[PDB]
RNA sequence: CCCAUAGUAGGCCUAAAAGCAGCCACCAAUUAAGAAAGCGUUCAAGCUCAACACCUCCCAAACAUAUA
């Protein structure tokens, strides 16, 4: 017969006894793996360097605010002097345990956002709360003070 | 729906860029020309601006302006009205750092452009931007 | 209102099989004639659904006979019908009705054992354009009353009309020629306002009626002040912006047989001087130079005419509005 | 010239005397044009083979209707058909040598790069009318990208550097162990139990 | 077309495996 | 359907599947989907609440307590309410 | 685990959430077996772990609400598979052949109605798939083509 | 510095895109 | 999963070609968003994505679980 014709050439049981005996097995796991178990820095740098200029710091679950009411919201927080901004949530743990405190621990979870500032303009952001249906004001820190909800409501009052 | 109008101060009932647009919303053609031309007569004119334009299911028109276009406002300023074909190789004018500030000064008056930063230097940088992109080069 | 393309299948030949005689049908031919409105009475033209063939042929076997004979197909179309073929260009030119244009493919036959041949039934590719919904596409401006212009022009009253398009049908209105017949226009789908004043009745049905080779510039003839809009965007400035739209959509199509519909001629009267204007606005370049011998602004100087809409005064109106209808079927 | 030149069906200058086609010019892992050019995808030849005229018209016919010359650039890296394959008259007597030449091919081995493509564009998109081309092809082929040849170099390392086999293909061979020798091609050393005549197995481990 | 299992294996590498022990203790 | 009452305030422990069904898909933000909204937010105590208390239009009235249901599952349950 | 009350009032309830066991000795695994130290001897004739696992109704328990690696899962719902055809789940009805282990639906496997050379032979499909290196206590190779 | 981080992720973001190119 | 504004309807050519008809630069304002990547657009408007908020009638019959 051809060396190479339409049909496959021919292997010679020898070679495929060889070639089954040159088997070649993958590694034999032992323990399997599958059933056993710079932007950062500067950020963290940048909060410490907020948290420590404004002498009040106010936390907020807001998220319902669309991008047209979070510039109304920037506006009346750059009408009156408040720096509104927002990081990572794991990044601001590491924060809150560089800046060493304990009450602001617990209420940073989920969508949230800080308002830093050292003149207190947190009753423009009451009244913003107040005329769309939302409490976003939640767990503040003015003057090394840790307040509530209803400490900020009688704060604003 | 949202639009983003053009249309020049001088005439605000054009035939090509006028209706064609927005038009499909319902609304008079008539009304929101004479509101384009009592803005524009509230304003300086011999420049497009561009207008906000608040349409509502109910027929009812919230014309908004705001200011002209940077880049319009930079070609009125170098003296050329037309750009380069070819940005930024062929330097069509030449605009100072003077001229540059008042423009940025004039863009951030405007609410409707919405450039409320609070460094200036942030609209400076812009305008320059803005300027490189077209056939503008910055002197000093 | 849209373009069609449509394919037309003929007559197909017969079968056998004796040993006396022979084959069956040929095959016939592709006609197209173009009908007047009453064509458009029978709601034909929303028919599409993937074209029509003809009938075939035939073989009788009792005793020793031969059979039947082809089909040809005749292609119809609601007001007007342009015909082209595969070609890339078209062989008959014209849009008015009465015309017939016809493709020839037959010669039929049968397979083998008596009298020989192998095929099937024919078919061509056939193209119509009607030139917009029935005769030329109407894009009015911020003062259009070409409704009641059209009507106050004509003494037939307006229908419903239909095309062969993918998209809805737009509105047609008959006009008078003071010639014992009428011709017709077209305007925007659904309501009528007219293109360039922010109305199409759609997106899409706005780039349907943009999308007509033959466009209508209506306008107001009468005064700004005078005119029946608040604000009006003045005769001259409307004017001019819509003619330099239409001209600089192609240069072609502004050296071909368009024209701009003078309205808002209810108004004005036979001393108002609507006349004089729409010659003025027609025989010059569409802008205030009436003739430029060697330096022209424009792509073309001393462009074509103007159209008569709510026709008044005994200068020619009426027989100024037949001559432009009949250049609008000329194609 | 974003597009693939058109390859001859012979040379201008011909090959005056008979040459035989040798299966070795095919046969092993090609180390030339095995790595990309100027390249950042193409076609690795998985397998030997000859490639004519026919086959490079066809691929050039392939590429050509599906390109965008201002994204996609492709050039043919094999050469033209060079190697005279001739055939002999027809109801002529058995045996007695060879006649005249009968048509041009070039030979090339398994690993070969065959078309480099290049530009605004990504492997991804032309990966459909490369495996169309790859199923068509005249040799067995695989479409790789310039990260997808490192990522298969990456893995035969892994699967080879991974063995757990008390016995290899050339730990008996090369020792010449249980007389396989008896079997054992002399080139066997060579392609060390990966490369069997026309066939090639990469999946070898 | 012929196959060869995992009978073939076992005795095999018995032939495999007595083959190196005897290459083996053959080097010194 | 009509408003929702919303209770949540600082008193007792905090819980992160009510403000999250507070923050999100009741509030202004889930007003697009829910035109016909009003949604407010209650910080009247209730006591261990985490309460999300809806009172709709027909006269439902929706409790989801809710300090150890999710905020998935307590968003699924106001959407079934709203189904019906 | 919650209900929802229907009555128009509805309303959204939380009751008889379920507990795990309270002596994991396999703690800390990736898959819910080896959270279980079950990491290869689940077999299909295992009523216990098919009630871990179905739904009821009989619905297929996505991994994250299982809490096993997707492997695991896979065996989860391959288990699954063998035992509710097996006519041992009886418990999760939606509104005659015996069998013993059946991978494939009924429904549409085709009649193997050409038997092929010996040289050339397909087998009938037998066995799950997913069990080729399910914990073995013999010495015999475990079929997969009967 | 946030000049150089925007640049950085404006070339991802053209990256991510000339990725989507071919899809 | 989620979120997607603005100088801006980036400029030349283009009736207009708005990121998406062809070219040049692709900057830049907010924690963070490509002078635009698959749609849709006559032009627009509306979808996402990247970046941020969350993480000739085939032919053996058969059986997986008993310690090479």
Not at chain 1, 84 to 95: D, S, T
Not at chain 3, 86 to 112: C, F, H, S
Not at chain 3, 228 to 255: C, D, M, N, V
Not at chain 3, 306 to 326: D, H, M, Q, Y
């Given at each position: 017969?051809?060396?190479?014709?339409?049909?496959?050439?021919?292997?010679?049981?020898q070679?495929?006894?060889?070639?089954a005996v040159?088997?070649?097995?993958?590694?034999?796991?032992?323990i399997?793996?599958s059933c056993?178990?710079?932007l950062?820095?500067?950020?963290?740098?940048?909060?410490?360097?907020?948290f420590?200029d404004?002498?009040?710091?106010?936390?907020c679950?807001?998220?319902?605010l669309?991008?047209?009411?979070?510039?109304?919201?920037?506006?009346?927080?750059?009408?009156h002097?408040?720096?509104?901004?927002?990081?990572?949530?794991?990044?601001?743990?590491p924060?809150?345990?560089?800046?060493?405190?304990?009450?602001?621990?617990?209420?940073?979870?989920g969508?949230?956002?800080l308002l830093?500032s050292?003149?207190?303009?947190?009753?423009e952001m009451?009244?913003?709360?107040?005329?769309?249906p939302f409490?976003?004001?939640?767990?503040?820190?003015?003057?090394?003070?840790?307040?509530?909800?209803?400490?900020?409501?009688?704060?604003?009052k | 729906?949202?639009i983003?109008?053009?249309?020049?101060?001088?005439?605000?009932?054009?035939?090509?860029?006028?209706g064609?647009?927005?038009?499909?919303?319902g609304?008079?053609?008539?009304?929101?020309?004479?509101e384009?031309?009592?803005?524009?007569?509230?304003?300086?004119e011999?420049?497009?601006?561009?207008?906000?334009?608040?349409?509502?299911p109910?027929?009812?028109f919230e014309?908004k302006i705001?200011q002209?276009?940077?880049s319009?406002?930079?070609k009125?300023?170098?003296?050329?009205?037309?750009?380069?074909?070819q940005?930024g190789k062929?330097?069509?004018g030449?605009?100072?750092?003077?001229?540059?500030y008042?423009?940025?000064?004039?863009?951030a008056?405007?609410?409707?452009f919405?450039?409320?930063?609070?460094?200036?230097?942030?609209?400076?940088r812009?305008?320059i931007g803005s300027?490189?992109?077209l056939?503008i080069?910055?002197?000093? | 209102?849209?373009?069609?393309?449509?394919?037309?299948?003929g007559?197909?030949?017969?079968?056998?099989?004796?040993?006396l005689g022979?084959?069956?049908?040929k095959?016939?031919?592709?006609?197209?004639?173009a009908?007047?409105?009453?064509?458009?009475?029978?709601?034909?033209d929303?028919?599409?659904?993937?074209?029509?063939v003809?009938?075939?042929?035939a073989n009788?076997?009792?005793?020793?006979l031969?059979?039947?004979?082809?089909?040809?197909?005749?292609?119809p179309?609601?007001?007007?019908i342009?015909?082209?073929?595969?070609?890339?260009?078209?062989?008959?030119?014209?849009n008015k009705?009465?015309?017939?244009?016809?493709?020839?493919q037959?010669?039929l036959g049968?397979?083998?054992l008596?009298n020989?041949l192998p095929?099937?039934?024919?078919?061509?590719?056939?193209?119509?354009?009607?030139?917009?919904?029935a005769?030329?596409?109407?894009?009015?401006?911020?003062?259009?009353?070409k409704s009641?212009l059209?009507?106050?022009?004509?003494?037939?009253?307006?229908?419903?009309?239909?095309?062969?398009?993918?998209?809805?049908?737009?509105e047609?209105?008959?006009?008078?020629?003071?010639?014992?017949?009428?011709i017709?226009?077209?305007?925007?789908?659904?309501?009528?306002?007219?293109?360039?004043?922010?109305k199409?009745?759609?997106?899409?049905?706005?780039?349907?009626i943009?999308?007509?080779?033959?466009?209508?510039?209506?306008?107001?003839?009468?005064?700004?002040?005078?005119?029946?809009?608040?604000?009006?965007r003045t005769?001259?400035?409307?004017?001019?912006?819509?003619?330099?739209?239409?001209?600089?959509?192609?240069?072609?199509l502004?050296?071909?047989?368009?024209?701009?519909?003078?309205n808002?001629?209810?108004?004005?009267?036979?001393?108002?001087?609507?006349?004089?204007?729409?010659?003025?606005?027609?025989?010059?370049?569409?802008?205030?130079?009436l003739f430029?011998?060697?330096?022209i602004?424009?792509?073309?100087?001393?462009?074509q005419?103007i159209?008569?809409?709510?026709?008044?005064?005994?200068?020619?109106?009426?027989?100024?509005?037949?001559?432009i209808?009949?250049?609008?079927?000329?194609? | 010239?974003?597009?693939?030149?058109?390859?001859?069906?012979?040379?201008?200058?011909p090959?005056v005397?008979?040459?035989?086609?040798?299966?070795?010019?095919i046969?092993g892992?090609?180390?030339?044009?095995?790595?990309?050019?100027?390249?950042?995808?193409?076609?690795?030849?998985?397998?030997?083979?000859?490639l004519?005229?026919?086959?490079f018209?066809?691929?050039?016919?392939?590429?050509?209707?599906?390109?965008?010359?201002?994204?996609?650039?492709?050039?043919?890296?094999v050469?033209?058909?060079?190697?005279?394959?001739?055939?002999?008259?027809?109801?002529?007597?058995?045996?007695?040598?060879?006649?005249?030449?009968d048509?041009?091919?070039?030979?090339?081995?398994?690993?070969?790069?065959?078309?480099?493509?290049?530009?605004?564009?990504e492997?991804?998109?032309?990966?459909?009318?490369?495996?169309?081309?790859?199923?068509?092809?005249?040799?067995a082929?695989?479409?790789?990208?310039?990260?997808?040849?490192?990522?298969?170099?990456?893995?035969?390392?892994?699967?080879?550097?991974n063995?757990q086999?008390?016995?290899?293909?050339?730990?008996?061979?090369?020792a010449?162990?249980?007389?396989?020798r008896k079997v054992?091609?002399?080139?066997?050393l060579?392609?060390?139990?990966?490369?069997?005549?026309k066939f090639?197995?990469?999946?070898?481990? | 077309?012929?196959?060869?299992?995992?009978?073939?294996?076992?005795?095999?590498?018995?032939?495999?495996?007595?083959?190196?022990?005897?290459?083996?203790?053959?080097?010194? | 359907?009509?408003?929702?009452?919303?209770?949540?305030?600082?008193?007792?422990?905090?819980?992160?599947?009510?403000?999250?069904?507070?923050?999100?898909?009741?509030?202004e933000?889930?007003?697009?989907?829910?035109?016909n909204?009003?949604?407010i937010?209650?910080?009247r105590?209730?006591g261990?609440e985490?309460?999300?208390?809806?009172?709709?239009g027909?006269?439902?009235?929706?409790?989801?307590?809710?300090?150890?249901?999710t905020?998935?599952?307590?968003?699924?349950?106001?959407?079934?309410?709203?189904?019906? | 685990?919650?209900?929802?009350?229907?009555?128009?009032?509805?309303?959204?309830?939380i009751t008889?959430?379920?507990?795990?066991?309270?002596?994991?000795?396999?703690?800390?695994?990736?898959?819910p077996?080896?959270?279980?130290?079950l990491?290869?001897?689940?077999?299909?004739?295992?009523?216990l772990?098919?009630?871990?696992?179905?739904?009821?109704?009989?619905?297929?328990?996505?991994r994250?609400?299982?809490?096993?690696?997707?492997?695991?899962?896979?065996?989860?719902?391959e288990?699954?598979?063998?035992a509710?055809?097996?006519?041992?789940?009886?418990?999760?009805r939606?509104?005659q052949?015996?069998?013993?282990?059946?991978?494939?639906?009924?429904g549409?496997?085709?009649?193997?109605?050409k038997?092929?050379?010996?040289?050339?032979?397909v087998?009938?499909?037998?066995?799950?798939?997913?069990?080729?290196?399910?914990?073995?206590?013999?010495?015999?190779?475990?079929?997969?083509?009967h | 510095?946030?000049?150089?981080?925007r640049?950085?992720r404006?070339?991802?973001?053209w990256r991510?895109?000339?990725?989507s190119?071919?899809?």
């Amino acid at each position: 017969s051809k060396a190479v014709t339409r049909h496959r050439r021919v292997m010679h049981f020898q070679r495929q006894k060889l070639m089954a005996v040159t088997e070649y097995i993958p590694p034999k796991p032992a323990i399997h793996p599958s059933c056993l178990p710079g932007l950062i820095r500067l950020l963290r740098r940048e909060i410490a360097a907020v948290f420590q200029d404004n002498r009040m710091i106010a936390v907020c679950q807001n998220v319902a605010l669309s991008a047209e009411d979070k510039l109304l919201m920037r506006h009346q927080l750059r009408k009156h002097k408040i720096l509104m901004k927002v990081f990572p949530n794991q990044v601001l743990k590491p924060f809150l345990e560089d800046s060493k405190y304990q009450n602001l621990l617990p209420l940073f979870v989920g969508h949230n956002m800080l308002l830093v500032s050292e003149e207190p303009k947190v009753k423009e952001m009451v009244r913003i709360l107040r005329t769309v249906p939302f409490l976003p004001l939640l767990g503040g820190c003015i003057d090394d003070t840790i307040l509530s909800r209803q400490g900020f409501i009688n704060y604003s009052k | 729906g949202v639009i983003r109008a053009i249309v020049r101060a001088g005439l605000a009932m054009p035939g090509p860029p006028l209706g064609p647009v927005l038009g499909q919303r319902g609304v008079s053609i008539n009304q929101f020309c004479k509101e384009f031309n009592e803005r524009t007569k509230d304003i300086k004119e011999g420049i497009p601006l561009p207008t906000k334009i608040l349409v509502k299911p109910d027929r009812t028109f919230e014309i908004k302006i705001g200011q002209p276009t940077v880049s319009y406002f930079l070609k009125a300023a170098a003296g050329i009205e037309k750009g380069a074909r070819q940005t930024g190789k062929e330097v069509a004018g030449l605009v100072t750092l003077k001229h540059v500030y008042e423009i940025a000064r004039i863009k951030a008056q405007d609410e409707a452009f919405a450039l409320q930063d609070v460094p200036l230097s942030s609209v400076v940088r812009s305008i320059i931007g803005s300027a490189r992109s077209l056939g503008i080069r910055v002197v000093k | 209102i849209d373009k069609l393309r449509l394919f037309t299948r003929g007559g197909s030949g017969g079968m056998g099989y004796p040993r006396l005689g022979g084959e069956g049908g040929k095959g016939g031919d592709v006609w197209v004639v173009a009908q007047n409105r009453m064509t458009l009475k029978q709601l034909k033209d929303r028919y599409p659904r993937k074209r029509f063939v003809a009938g075939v042929g035939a073989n009788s076997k009792i005793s020793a006979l031969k059979g039947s004979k082809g089909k040809d197909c005749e292609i119809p179309v609601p007001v007007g019908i342009s015909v082209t073929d595969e070609n890339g260009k078209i062989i008959g030119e014209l849009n008015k009705e009465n015309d017939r244009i016809l493709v020839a493919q037959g010669g039929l036959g049968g397979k083998l054992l008596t009298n020989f041949l192998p095929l099937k039934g024919q078919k061509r590719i056939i193209h119509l354009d009607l030139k917009l919904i029935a005769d030329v596409g109407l894009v009015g401006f911020p003062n259009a009353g070409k409704s009641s212009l059209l009507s106050c022009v004509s003494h037939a009253k307006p229908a419903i009309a239909d095309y062969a398009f993918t998209t809805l049908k737009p509105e047609l209105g008959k006009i008078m020629y003071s010639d014992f017949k009428q011709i017709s226009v077209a305007d925007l789908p659904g309501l009528i306002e007219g293109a360039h004043m922010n109305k199409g009745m759609g997106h899409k049905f706005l780039k349907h009626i943009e999308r007509t080779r033959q466009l209508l510039f209506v306008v107001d003839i009468s005064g700004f002040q005078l005119s029946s809009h608040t604000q009006y965007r003045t005769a001259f400035e409307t004017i001019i912006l819509l003619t330099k739209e239409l001209e600089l959509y192609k240069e072609e199509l502004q050296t071909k047989p368009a024209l701009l519909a003078v309205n808002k001629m209810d108004l004005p009267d036979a001393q108002d001087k609507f006349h004089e204007l729409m010659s003025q606005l027609q025989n010059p370049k569409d802008f205030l130079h009436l003739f430029e011998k060697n330096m022209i602004p424009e792509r073309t100087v001393e462009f074509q005419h103007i159209i008569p809409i709510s026709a008044v005064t005994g200068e020619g109106i009426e027989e100024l509005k037949n001559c432009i209808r009949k250049s609008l079927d000329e194609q | 010239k974003p597009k693939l030149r058109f390859i001859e069906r012979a040379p201008l200058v011909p090959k005056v005397r008979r040459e035989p086609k040798n299966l070795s010019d095919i046969r092993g892992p090609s180390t030339e044009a095995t790595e990309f050019t100027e390249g950042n995808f193409a076609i690795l030849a998985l397998g030997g083979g000859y490639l004519h005229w026919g086959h490079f018209e066809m691929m050039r016919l392939t590429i050509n209707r599906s390109m965008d010359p201002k994204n996609m650039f492709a050039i043919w890296r094999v050469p033209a058909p060079f190697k005279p394959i001739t055939r002999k008259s027809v109801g002529h007597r058995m045996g007695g040598g060879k006649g005249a030449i009968d048509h041009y091919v070039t030979p090339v081995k398994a690993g070969r790069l065959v078309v480099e493509m290049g530009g605004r564009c990504e492997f991804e998109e032309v990966q459909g009318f490369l495996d169309q081309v790859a199923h068509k092809l005249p040799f067995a082929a695989k479409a790789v990208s310039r990260g997808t040849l490192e990522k298969m170099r990456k893995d035969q390392e892994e699967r080879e550097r991974n063995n757990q086999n008390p016995w290899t293909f050339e730990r008996i061979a090369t020792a010449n162990m249980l007389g396989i020798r008896k079997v054992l091609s002399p080139y066997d050393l060579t392609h060390k139990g990966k490369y069997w005549g026309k066939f090639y197995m990469p999946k070898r481990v | 077309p012929r196959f060869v299992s995992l009978r073939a294996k076992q005795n095999m590498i018995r032939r495999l495996e007595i083959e190196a022990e005897n290459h083996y203790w053959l080097s010194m | 359907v009509k408003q929702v009452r919303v209770q949540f305030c600082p008193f007792e422990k905090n819980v992160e599947s009510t403000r999250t069904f507070l923050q999100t898909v009741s509030s202004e933000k889930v007003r697009s989907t829910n035109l016909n909204c009003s949604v407010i937010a209650d910080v009247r105590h209730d006591g261990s609440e985490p309460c999300v208390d809806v009172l709709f239009g027909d006269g439902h009235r929706l409790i989801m307590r809710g300090a150890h249901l999710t905020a998935l599952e307590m968003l699924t349950a106001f959407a079934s309410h709203i189904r019906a | 685990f919650r209900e929802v009350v229907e009555t128009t009032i509805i309303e959204g309830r939380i009751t008889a959430t379920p507990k795990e066991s309270p002596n994991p000795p396999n703690p800390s695994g990736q898959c819910p077996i080896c959270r279980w130290n079950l990491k290869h001897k689940y077999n299909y004739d295992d009523v216990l772990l098919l009630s871990q696992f179905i739904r009821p109704h009989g619905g297929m328990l996505p991994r994250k609400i299982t809490g096993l690696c997707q492997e695991e899962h896979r065996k989860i719902e391959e288990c699954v598979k063998m035992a509710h055809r097996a006519g041992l789940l009886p418990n999760h009805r939606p509104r005659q052949l015996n069998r013993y282990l059946t991978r494939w639906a009924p429904g549409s496997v085709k009649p193997i109605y050409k038997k092929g050379p010996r040289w050339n032979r397909v087998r009938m499909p037998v066995g799950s798939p997913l069990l080729r290196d399910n914990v073995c206590y013999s010495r015999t190779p475990w079929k997969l083509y009967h | 510095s946030r000049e150089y981080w925007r640049r950085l992720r404006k070339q991802n973001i053209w990256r991510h895109n000339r990725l989507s190119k071919n899809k």
